Design a protein around this ligand. Structure first.
Ligand SMILES: NC(=O)c1ccc[n+]([C@@H]2O[C@H](COP(=O)([O-])OP(=O)(O)OC[C@H]3O[C@@H](n4cnc5c(N)ncnc54)[C@H](OP(=O)(O)O)[C@@H]3O)[C@@H](O)[C@H]2O)c1
Ligand SMILES: [Fe+3]
Length: 359
């Protein structure tokens, strides 16, 4: 059996909040905006959102304190500040961190007796405020997925499945402010979503169609996007959205799980972390799906590994034996394993990290 479900109404273009944003008036009269500390003030996005809320006569509060890789505590800081209000909907503005934060808060503001940990029990998540997502990186695709990735108190990034956003608004102009480094990392996150979705045991025909297009766009446009080419950035933002729609159908694979400690413990941005390990996870997946792995390598010019190396993705990462064994143990228990072709023993995982990180 396969299923397709992706109910978000997605709007893409320059000045999209002006041109299509008034539809949010269907959601109510009061909104909570969640965003990061600075970037949305410098790319016009927060100003455009304030213009839209004023136009639609929707009152609002702004929580501009979402941290990268938001923790359970960061979510608690907001939910405590805002459960005594009466919001009709939540708007996430920024990258995956505030977009994921918006999904968690939209559940917790409605379900007032739930804890953050309860978000990980599907049975407990019955109701929620509607969510609108306005992405500014290219990207996580969070605007078209039901997932929220939070860092638990023990320091482990952990994903939960909540709701799809009702509306997603993509204005490529917002991504023009990304640094070259952020463009690389977010672009490789999009790449990883497309590749992992295509290679996943949960692959479907519609998600494969979207993934193949996203891969082709990314191969063609990521180098130029990193250098600041605006047309290429617009195309990357499209591809990140397609790749989100893919993983909304498939979920991700072990590559995503293995990147998590690199982000939390070694300071490596999520997309770069996943990308570094991805080619080495694919070498194991070839035991089961060599033809699909060959297709991915072909799309990326012959070798996804070489494509990534050429973009300067790899960097020296210091790793102790204690760290490596901890990550191997965690990786061996990843829920993602069931979705990943191939057989992943602790040794294969150990080797993936050693090869990816130069240790
Ligand atoms: N939900 C999902 O399906 C899913 C999938 C993959 C990954 N993720 C998660 O998403 C998070 C990563 O999201 P992300 O890679 O988009 O980055 P992010 O963590 O949201 O932000 C990274 C940095 O980029 C800045 N920034 C954002 N937009 C910018 C812009 N247009 N121009 C200049 N700087 C900008 C932010 O600044 P400010 O803080 O000042 O705004 C921040 O310092 C991780 O927690 C990851 O696990 C979620
Ligand atoms: Fe990701």
């Amino acid at each position: 059996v396969w299923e397709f479900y992706m109910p978000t109404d997605v709007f893409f273009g320059e000045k999209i909040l002006e041109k299509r944003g008034n539809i949010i008036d269907l959601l109510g009269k009061r909104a909570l905006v969640v965003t990061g500390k600075s970037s949305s003030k410098k790319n016009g996005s927060l100003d455009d959102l304030k213009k839209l809320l004023d136009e639609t006569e929707i009152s609002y509060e702004i929580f501009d304190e979402v941290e990268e890789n938001p923790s359970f505590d960061n979510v608690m800081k907001a939910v405590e500040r805002y459960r005594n209000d009466s919001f009709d909907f939540v708007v996430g503005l920024g990258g995956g961190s505030p977009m994921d934060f918006a999904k968690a808060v939209a559940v917790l503001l409605k379900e007032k007796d739930l804890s953050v940990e309860d978000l990980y029990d599907r049975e407990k998540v019955k109701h929620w405020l509607p969510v609108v997502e306005i992405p500014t990186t290219a990207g996580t695709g969070s605007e078209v997925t039901p997932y929220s990735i939070l860092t638990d108190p023990e320091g482990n990034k952990r994903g939960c499945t909540l709701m799809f956003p009702v509306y997603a608004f993509l204005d490529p102009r917002y991504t023009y402010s990304m640094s070259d480094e952020l463009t690389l990392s977010t672009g490789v996150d999009a790449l990883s979503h497309a590749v992992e979705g295509y290679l996943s045991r949960k692959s479907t025909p519609p998600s494969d169609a979207l993934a193949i297009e996203a891969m082709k766009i990314i191969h063609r446009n990521l180098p130029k996007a990193i250098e600041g080419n605006r047309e290429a950035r617009k195309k990357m933002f499209v591809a990140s959205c397609l790749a989100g729609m893919v993983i909304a159908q498939t979920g991700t694979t072990l590559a995503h799980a293995l990147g998590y400690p690199l982000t939390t413990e070694k300071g490596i941005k999520h997309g770069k972390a996943t990308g570094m390990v991805l080619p080495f996870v694919m070498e194991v997946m070839k035991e089961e799906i060599p033809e699909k792995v060959d297709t991915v390598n072909h799309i990326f010019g012959g070798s996804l590994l070489k494509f990534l190396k050429e973009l300067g993705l790899y960097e020296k990462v210091a790793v102790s034996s204690e760290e490596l064994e901890k990550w191997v143990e965690k990786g061996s228990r990843a829920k993602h394993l069931k979705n990943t072709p191939g057989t992943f023993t602790p040794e294969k995982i150990r080797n993936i990290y050693r090869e990816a990180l130069g240790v």
